[PDB]
Design a protein around this ligand. Sequence first.
Ligand SMILES: Nc1ncnc2c1ncn2[C@@H]1O[C@H](COP(=O)(O)OP(=O)(O)OP(=O)(O)O)[C@@H](O)[C@H]1O
Ligand SMILES: Nc1ncnc2c1ncn2[C@@H]1O[C@H](COP(=O)(O)OP(=O)(O)OP(=O)(O)O)[C@@H](O)[C@H]1O
Ligand SMILES: [Mg+2]
Ligand SMILES: [Mg+2]
Lengths: 73, 73
Amino acid sequence: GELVGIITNRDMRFEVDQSKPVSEVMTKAPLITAKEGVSAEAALGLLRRHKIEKLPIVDGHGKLTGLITVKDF
Amino acid sequence: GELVGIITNRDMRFEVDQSKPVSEVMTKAPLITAKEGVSAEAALGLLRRHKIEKLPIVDGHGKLTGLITVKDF
Ligand SMILES: Nc1ncnc2c1ncn2[C@@H]1O[C@H](COP(=O)(O)OP(=O)(O)OP(=O)(O)O)[C@@H](O)[C@H]1O
Ligand SMILES: Nc1ncnc2c1ncn2[C@@H]1O[C@H](COP(=O)(O)OP(=O)(O)OP(=O)(O)O)[C@@H](O)[C@H]1O
Ligand SMILES: [Mg+2]
Ligand SMILES: [Mg+2]
């Protein structure tokens, strides 16, 4: 139940071997994530600073509890 | 005319101050580039390895002489 990475279409596009597992392509942790209760503005600032479109939201124990995208803004 | 970086729409999407110069926003050198005579296959392989959409092509002296994009493929 712990977050160990993320896989997006920029990774999958630049990958040819379809039979590959996710573990060989994904961006492995530590990811750019945020904690519960983060304001929208701070999440937007983090997405702007790190030039990413997805921000996993995790709890106190590292369990994934949400996902914020810049597409929603 | 010596190449000192690249600025793309992701960089300018994540800078709110519209009066900023390029030097403050651009991804600075050394960039992922390639030399003249690189085949489309090696250029595509580099773009796939480094998860970027653009590839400056420079000559033997570091001067920019082309630009290869994944959108063309
Ligand atoms: N939270 C994160 N922390 C670290 N890297 C991340 C995070 N989210 C995404 N990335 C990485 O950022 C890169 C770009 O992925 P992103 O999802 O931002 O673009 P995309 O939706 O694939 O883009 P496009 O719309 O151009 O196809 C990928 O290598 C991805 O693994
Ligand atoms: N050749 C390169 N070397 C290093 N960094 C680069 C290179 N080309 C682009 N970048 C940087 O990589 C990031 C993504 O740029 P890229 O042009 O690949 O995507 P984009 O066209 O802005 O994305 P999107 O289509 O999702 O809006 C930006 O921060 C950009 O400055
Ligand atoms: Mg996009
Ligand atoms: Mg794109």
